[PDB]
Design a protein around this ligand. Structure first.
Ligand SMILES: NC(=[NH2+])NCCC[C@H](N)C(=O)O
Ligand code: MET
Ligand SMILES: [Cl-]
Ligand code: NA
Length: 417
């Protein structure tokens, strides 16, 4: 059962789903199609939860027979009640400047084995765990990686013995959340999970479910989209609000962002799926958008699909780039904090840039002003010049990261004004 602990030594920063992932967590007996596991294992480590050595051998045989990349397959032996790894597995946070930790909570379901799982996850990953005494579920949580978290109202109503202020304080203490945006769920369904209607695609992008004009939740969802469209994101610009039209409860927001690939559940008709996949492609240049059909025995549902049955795993040796970009009409100095959770040697730290969209991107070394603090000034440009840039860093543990994560295909853009 859940065990409360003191929060992590600060400062704390919750890691977003679109940050670097070292693996993805799935569970057996499966709630996902084998084709999805095969596609995930092609590029990423797939950790499968099984209850015993016998179940591990059964899964190995299924993976082997289906041509799954076994070199990217590992296992955790732990009892579980369900395959909703999104909802009961631990949440990732950076803390004490150079560490990655796991945050446990009271799973809001009568599933004691699922509730106990984060202890096994932290042990497997070789990371510390912290017990946040809140009734929570991963399906109802998303962070932008800049201290904001969006959750439906059950984050308050399922913690009714605490004031909203005490609930907010726990999110701040254990996950570094400074903006706990608890909203009235606009879907009118029993589940009240953010992932059934909303998803941050980047710190400045949010996807909000859209339904036909006649649907009873049409105005609630339009109001939610307008609410995000009118607010300033972590980067100081208004959110880019994208909409995925569900003509018949297709769970298009219930996708998985895993490194440079996005796994979107598709239920049909093909024309409606194609429109939703093209919204992701428009919103996320450089990402591989993959439509995934459901398993006939455990199909995708409006309230429960691909995101619900997966959970990304952060990199405990994460080469992290902290940066607030210079954007739009605009001193033209960028600053970035670059820290290695592996305590690896960081070199080089570069700014890749392009002027007026001409030619290839050019690299310039950033200056290290103080430990882990890098700067670069844009100089010798002309008024009305347009700039594209991104940050690039590598370390001697073989890690290579860009900011934004996808790098060159979606650079930061500003105009010399
Ligand atoms: N992240 C999610 N959408 N989770 C769906 C969980 C569905 C499951 N039947 C429950 O209510 O527990
Ligand atoms: C209360 S309805 C729950 C639906 C599904 N059994 C999950 O859990
Ligand atoms: Cl403690
Ligand atoms: Na738990």
């Amino acid at each position: 059962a859940f065990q409360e602990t003191n929060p992590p030594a600060g400062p704390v920063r919750a890691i977003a789903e679109y940050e670097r992932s070292a693996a993805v967590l799935v569970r057996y007996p499966f709630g996902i199609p084998m084709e999805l596991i095969k596609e995930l294992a092609k590029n990423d480590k797939v950790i499968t939860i099984v209850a015993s050595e016998s179940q591990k051998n059964t899964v190995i045989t299924q993976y082997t027979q289906s041509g799954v990349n076994l070199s990217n397959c590992d296992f955790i032996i732990a009892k579980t009640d369900s395959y909703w790894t999104r909802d009961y597995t631990g949440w990732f946070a950076m803390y004490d400047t150079n560490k990655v930790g796991l945050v446990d909570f009271i799973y809001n379901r009568p599933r004691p084995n699922d509730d106990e799982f984060p202890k096994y996850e932290a042990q497997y990953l070789g990371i510390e765990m912290f017990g946040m005494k809140l009734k929570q579920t991963g399906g109802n949580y998303m962070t932008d990686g800049y201290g904001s978290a969006v959750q439906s109202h059950i984050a308050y109503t399922e913690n009714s013995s605490l004031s909203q202020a005490q609930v907010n304080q726990k999110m701040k203490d254990y996950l570094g959340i400074t903006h706990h945006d608890v909203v009235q769920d606009p879907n009118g369904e029993y589940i009240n999970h953010v992932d059934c209607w909303g998803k941050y695609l980047a710190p400045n992008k949010i996807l909000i479910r859209k339904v036909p004009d006649n649907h009873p939740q049409h105005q609630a969802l339009e109001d939610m989209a307008a609410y995000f469209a009118a607010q300033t994101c972590a980067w100081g610009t208004k959110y880019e609000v994208y909409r995925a039209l569900a003509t018949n409860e297709q769970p298009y927001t219930n996708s998985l962002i895993l490194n440079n690939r996005v796994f979107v559940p598709v239920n049909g008709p093909a024309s409606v799926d194609n429109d939703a996949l093209n919204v992701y492609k428009t919103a996320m240049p450089g990402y591989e958008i993959i439509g995934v059909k459901g398993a006939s025995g455990t199909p995708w549902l409006g309230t429960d699909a691909l995101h619900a049955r997966t959970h990304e795993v952060a990199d405990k040796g994460y080469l992290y780039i902290k940066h607030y970009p210079i954007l739009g009409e605009q001193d033209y100095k960028i600053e970035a904090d670059v820290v290695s959770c592996a305590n690896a040697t960081i070199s080089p730290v570069q700014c890749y840039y392009r002027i007026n969209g001409s030619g290839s991107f050019k690299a310039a070394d950033m200056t290290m002003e103080s430990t882990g603090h890098y700067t670069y000034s844009f100089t010798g440009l002309n008024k009305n010049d347009k700039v594209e840039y991104y940050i690039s860093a590598a370390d001697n543990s073989g890690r290579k990261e860009t900011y934004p994560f996808i790098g060159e295909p979606d650079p930061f853009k500003f105009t010399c004004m």
